Amino acid sequence: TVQSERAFQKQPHIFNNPKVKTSKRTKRWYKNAGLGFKTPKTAIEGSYIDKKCPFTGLVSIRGKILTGTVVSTKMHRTIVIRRAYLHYIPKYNRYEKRHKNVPVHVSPAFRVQVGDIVTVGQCRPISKTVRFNVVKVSAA
Template identity: 70%
Template sequence: MADQNERSFQRQPTIFLNRKKGVGPKRRKSLRYHREVGLGFKTPRETEKAFQKQPTIFVNRKSGGKKKLRLSRNVGLGFKTPREAIEGSYIDKKCPFTGNVSIRGRILTGVVQKMKMQRTIVIRRDYLHYIRKYNRFEKRHRNMSVHLSPCFRYWFYNLFYRK
């Protein structure tokens, strides 16, 4: 008898259980990455108040040509430009592929520890420190805050190269 009551309760339309705010038709998903502005130009959907654009690209062109409006470059040192940097719509002035940053002398390795900041992660660098008295090494580590461009795919505990 208890099973029938539970089943009949589950079949009832839920009014308050698992109901989100807002009554009416389903809301459309907001475009997370970009929106169309016109002339085939896509702008990123950001939280910043200023208009996001690359400083080397002129957005207010008069002719509607088919030329792409995105700057991406080869940074060298054996790094291939990610497809997201070429085709994506994000704006990041600190990205080595789309911004104005040199990576020479700034490449370090580490393991991703935290991803709670916006476009910034915390990496852990492990190293050995020699103690002469005992003729031994001890393990030490440093946490570093590192800028992470949106063109990279990353997960926790991945080995990461700082740029």
């Protein structure tokens, strides 16, 4: 069920007129990111309502573009990706591995499981601890 929350979960500023009949019930707005990324047809036909969705919600992706590897996928609509990168210790001149366990909101249009090279982009602050949003998927 899509509308299972308290209020009518709809995409705002979007009008459908029941007078003139149509093929798909609600003409769903979606704009392009640009920035080298491609819009997904799963979002174009996506019936989900995510105002935090980078394609169908009213959010902007302008700035840093990173990527990461997911470890846990046990929330709703968001995950945590862990990135172990090299760190340099000059007083030993020795390298080490250090992992940032950083979270990111995901869209349901992309299905992501553990073992995913996910490419994300930053946004304006989405929640308390997230400022990233997924755009590109490469699962394994």
